[PDB]
């Protein structure tokens, strides 16, 4: 960690520090010693835990601890049974079933457990294999790994930098820092200390960056992980192991359920122990409690529903790498998004053009076919000709049918933008360019900042010479003697100069690259047609031009970005733009896209409007803030928190990846779920750190995709709002499913408590409740996930992570006490009906379990005096258990019907709106019929055939459940916030 | 707060009171259908089971005649059962009637209605259980190799056993078949090996027949016919191998009577006896 950057040092200082020479360089022996000391020039991959370890760790998450305890208790009970000879068995079956359930839940959780993998492979395209290094005063190609700090390296054009080097001898070297800043604009390189910040020093080449053109010589100052790219990779890979909000909510729900189960088990175990109960019965009852209290199929159902939502979203061209990412989006409070490539097409295009003393607006859509901006007016033909002729960019071959915007052009970015504009508006420039016999003299230089090209018109009448000029507007103007307005070349005046200056000021303030265009006519008297020309600028004039027009390029935002941003903001999500671009362009794009409202103004804007010093203006009035990289650098965490809290709309510019990660962390410190959208390597740390990271598909780099939880294959920003809606809907449906499962949990639990307390014959067996959990409750639980939104999802604000939980106290109270007890009562009614009709009245069943289960007794007397054998008693017990199970299923049908909506009535939501509900009801009925008749026809698993009437005994109780829930929801709707909404609403 | 707690507690009290009221109302509505005289269904207890008096733990009867404590449990249980069969308990003629001493056809004593008050019961005297009545015999039969078990048929309300038809020969010529008014009962070694050591079996029943007389049935449910005395059939072996465990199965033969593999006590016995010398 060498953070003491050294770029201000001169050549002699560098030589003294690293003990090397520019001409000589590091010696081979010295190079080997340095390799041994420091190490190879490579990025060390992160340590990855074996997938087997993760799979086994998945065997203890959730309720698996309780299931393992239950299996151990079942084995103990079976051992006790074997000791005291008893061929009952039925415990090994329970143990095997519990073990299989644990295994299945572990597998489902593993398939739901993120993706892991590594991100170092993403840098394969970068990280050049070999480099040219001078050793012993000689140049020899050496592998990049063997490269060590101190040796002299030379980089030509079109090759990756071998390592972080400090340029010493550069001749017009240009490099691309898209990896660091995320901007593809070439950056000039030199050998002087330009900027204090090393990232902008302008005299330091960076590892894995590409040298666009020119040649330079540099001294290695960093290697491997010590390089900037190495540190970014370390941040991206190392960090990123955290629990998503959905996982935290699931853990909280598991904690609640496990605590309830453990507390009930302890209390009732102590009670049974203090009631003169054999340890065997105590352990059996403990196993029953554990089975009843643990919803086995809930977690697998959650995984299945998440997978279904992921499949639908992928069908919507929104790939989801991590399964929990579907829910993570939505319930998000802050969105930190990159400017270039994410909110912008990343393609330089002409937006505004000023001529005739008035401003025009040009279409900036990527799929646009053509646009019109008062083209009928004069002075437009001259501008079109000047743009078409005065250009060097060319289309790549084989792009006839390819869209012109999507075509590839071999030239400068601005040149490509003008070429695209001319193709869109004018037509095919190839024929136009061919018509005019352009003169090879096309001198353009950085110092000149103008380029002119002599042309001869193809008009038969005129057939005269045409000179075209463009460049920096100021020098173009000062080479302009007259200005042509609507055809006439009005001489340049003070008024015209002032208007031009004002237009240039406004265009520059809109953060656009303004370029001036001017041409002159050459009468045949001075320069005849055969007159020969020289590019040395001596054969032709270079002044007294006629200014024609002015236009700028902005790199406009994506077509759908503004609408998506507006919808996200209206949905209560705060949008923050973090970019590595210049503050002016960032502010302009933020205003255009809608991150900053039109009426809202920054403190600098307020000061400018009031014509006062910035310190004088109070910060309260300003509702928007633009913070550069340096200000964030010299900002304590408290100041950052205050800034985030106080300002609704914030724009960050010139931020390094570390600063992006700092911003993400600061946002997360406000108890807010943050989602980061990016498409660049510099976004990798932020994408990893953020709760959900969305990476742009087509424009995104491999690193962004690998470090992103979600990928937008089609690069449409409306997928963000779609995902927000899907996440909120998933949250609601998960609440409904959890309540549905808990209701049946309590319904199963109550009978065992009654059996222990009142000593009734076992109303229901453990295997029956296992069948309830893993059978009839699967399809209904999945169907509840298909429910439509009851109200407008977007209108609601994002849910607070702390205050709002997936499973709250009201939900548990309603599911456990309110609806669970109703189902228990219905089941007990059916049980008593079953027993009474066979000769056992309800009062005779009190404290009858001890004699009931005694295998020795074969003449037990019922209420009518009849005597029952042991087997007949247990067959009646199985019939009662089956009746209880059927009653539970029947009441669970009404439970599902009521649970399909939380506030609306069934009449409003529509009974048949969701067909998966009816599929689930049919599944419940079919499973019950199979278990009762197919199984049970031969008595197995405590199942027996049931009489017809025993199916319909519990219907009135289901009707009562539905009526009660409907009345509750009706009174909630009638009186909002009237002590009924506060308590009853869940 | 206190007020909110009071409101919530009141709501829950009312809600649970209403739930309990609904539950008890549904239970009472269901109970209205059932009748206190006869059960609605007799699916489970339709074919009556066969059970023994000594009420042994695991179908095992092991004892040593020398030590009284070995057979004290069995003797005490048998005495406890037979207590109500003494002639003193049947001295009252208001409810006990001296029915025929010879087996007769089942006598319908009315219908299952609250009218006609109660029903009289044909009394059963212990004298018919010769060698096992306990009147003259002491400790019943549990002297040296004389185990005695009393076989009884599980009471089923409104059930009239049908003795096997003479169409097919039940077993070895019974001579005293008398199928019109006797339900045959036979005891034999469970497996081929046991038959060798089981020795001979002595049956003591009413009138000398080896079965339950039909005059006692049908039973009327302990409400219309309280103090009902079911017929008994005492079985005594009097000769069996010593220090060897014998599996003995007792079976009741009748067209109405049924059998099942799942239920071993449905019209059949599985009893193991071992007299430790
Ligand atoms: C005899 C055998 C009976 C068997 C029947 C089944 C019994 C099973 C019962 C289970 C109940 C489980 C309760 C789960 C609690 C979760 C804890 C938790 O993490 O909750 C989170 C909440 C968050 O709330 P918030 O900030 O969103 O609220 C905002 C309020 N606003 C709107 C005013 C601003 O924290 C809170 O509210 C505080 C929650 C405190 C919960 C106290 C529970 C007290 C005791 C319950 C035992 C019930 C016995 C029933 C006996 C029945 C016999 C017939
Ligand atoms: C997709 C969502 C819905 C899932 C529904 C799952 C339902 C599972 C129920 C299966 C019961 C099938 C019964 C078929 C019996 C045919 C008998 C003939 O005739 C002599 C036979 C002795 C039979 C012993 C039992 C054999 C097989 C049943 C095994 C079931 C195990 C289930 C464990 C998980 C609850
Ligand atoms: C066990 C207990 C199970 C029973 C428990 C609950 C049943 C409650 C009764 C059913 C619910 C009421 C009927 C209902 O609310 O209907 C509504 C729909 C029409 O709503 P919409 O689309 O015009 O709303 C438009 C909304 N806006 C105005 C915003 C555009 O009416 C329709 O579609 C046509 C059907 C309406 C007529 C009633 C049909 C009754 C049939 C079945 C009930 C469920 C029995 C389940 C038994 C087990 C089956 C195996
Ligand atoms: C508004 C629309 C929904 C209305 C409610 C629908 C659900 C309840 C309605 C009917 C359920 C019972 C009837 C089911 C269909 C008829 C099946 C049946 O045949 O059912 C008869 C049993 C009573 O049979 P039994 O004594 O006449 O048979 C004598 C047999 N033998 C002659 C051999 C001695 O009816 C019984 O169990 C009655 C059980 C009493 C408790 C039921 C719950 C009462 C709560 C209210
Ligand atoms: C945690 C537990 C808290 C509660 C504990 C309660 C303990 C009660 C124990 C003993 C009290 C006995 C006092 C009455 C006996 C004499 C009167 C009599 O016996 O009348 C009985 C009838 O009763 C009634 O009509 C009222 C209903 C009484 C139902 C009692 C059910 C007992 C079962 C309780 C378990 C409930 C479990 C619920 C759990 C829910 C969890 C959320 C006898 O009718 P029968 O059979 O002769 O009718 C024959 C037919 N017919 C009437 C047409 C002639
Ligand atoms: C009379 C008896 C049967 C009532 C038993 C009620 C018991 C089971 C209830 C009452 C209070 C409940 C606890 C309330 C708060 C918490 C903290 C939470 O982080 C885990 C669940 C846990 C620990 C609950 C478990 C269940 C609980 C202990
Ligand atoms: C009858 C006795 C013995 C057992 C049942 C007691 C009932 C009334 C108790 C047990 C648990 C209690 C609830 C526990 C938690 C809450 C959440 C709180 O924000 C409002 C009160 C409320 C909703 C309580 C209401 C009363 C309650 C339901
Ligand atoms: C058994 O009874 C018979 C008469 O039925 C009697 O002769 C015999 O002596 C009795 N048994 C014993 C051991 O006395
Ligand atoms: F396009 Al960027 F940081 F501005 F990735
Ligand atoms: K359960
Ligand atoms: K992430
Ligand atoms: K459940
Ligand atoms: Mg980008």
Coordinates of N, CA and C and ligand atoms in Angstrom, one line a residue, chain A residues 837 948-949 952-953 955-956, chain B residues 26 29-30 33 40-41, ligand 4:
Chain A
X837 N -70.2 -40.6 16.7 CA -71.1 -41.5 15.9 C -70.7 -43.0 16.1
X948 N -68.8 -39.9 3.6 CA -69.0 -38.7 2.8 C -69.2 -37.5 3.8
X949 N -70.0 -37.7 4.8 CA -70.4 -36.5 5.6 C -69.2 -35.9 6.3
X952 N -67.7 -32.6 4.7 CA -68.4 -31.4 4.7 C -68.7 -30.9 6.1
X953 N -68.2 -31.5 7.2 CA -68.6 -31.1 8.5 C -67.9 -29.7 8.8
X955 N -67.2 -27.3 6.7 CA -67.5 -26.2 5.8 C -68.0 -25.0 6.6
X956 N -69.0 -25.1 7.5 CA -69.5 -23.9 8.2 C -68.3 -23.1 8.9
Chain B
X26 N -72.1 -25.5 17.8 CA -71.9 -26.6 16.8 C -71.8 -28.0 17.4
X29 N -75.3 -28.9 18.4 CA -76.1 -29.3 17.2 C -75.8 -30.7 16.7
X30 N -74.5 -31.0 16.6 CA -74.1 -32.3 16.2 C -74.6 -33.4 17.2
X33 N -78.1 -34.9 16.9 CA -78.4 -36.0 15.9 C -78.2 -37.4 16.6
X40 N -74.9 -44.6 16.2 CA -75.3 -44.3 14.8 C -74.7 -45.3 13.9
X41 N -73.4 -45.7 14.1 CA -72.7 -46.7 13.3 C -72.0 -47.7 14.1
Ligands
LIG4 C1 -75.1 -22.5 3.7 C2 -74.5 -23.7 2.8 C3 -73.6 -24.6 3.7 C4 -74.5 -25.2 4.8 C5 -73.6 -26.2 5.7 C6 -73.0 -27.3 4.8 C7 -72.2 -28.2 5.6 C8 -73.0 -29.0 6.6 C9 -74.2 -29.6 5.8 C10 -74.3 -31.0 5.6 C11 -73.2 -31.9 6.2 C12 -73.8 -33.2 6.7 C13 -74.5 -33.8 5.5 C14 -73.5 -34.1 4.4 C15 -74.2 -34.7 3.1 C16 -75.1 -35.9 3.6 C17 -74.3 -37.1 4.0 C18 -75.1 -37.8 5.2 O1 -75.7 -38.8 4.9 O2 -75.0 -37.2 6.5 C19 -75.8 -37.9 7.5 C20 -75.3 -37.5 8.9 C21 -76.2 -38.2 9.9 O3 -76.4 -39.5 9.5 P1 -77.6 -40.5 10.0 O4 -77.4 -40.6 11.5 O5 -78.9 -40.0 9.4 O6 -77.2 -41.9 9.4 C22 -77.8 -43.1 9.8 C23 -77.2 -44.3 9.1 N1 -77.9 -45.5 9.4 C24 -79.3 -45.4 8.8 C25 -77.2 -46.7 8.9 C26 -78.0 -45.6 10.9 O7 -75.5 -36.1 9.1 C27 -74.6 -35.5 10.1 O8 -73.6 -36.2 10.4 C28 -74.8 -34.2 10.7 C29 -73.6 -33.7 11.4 C30 -73.9 -32.6 12.4 C31 -72.8 -31.6 12.6 C32 -72.6 -30.8 11.3 C33 -72.3 -29.3 11.6 C34 -73.5 -28.6 12.2 C35 -73.1 -27.1 12.3 C36 -74.0 -26.2 11.8

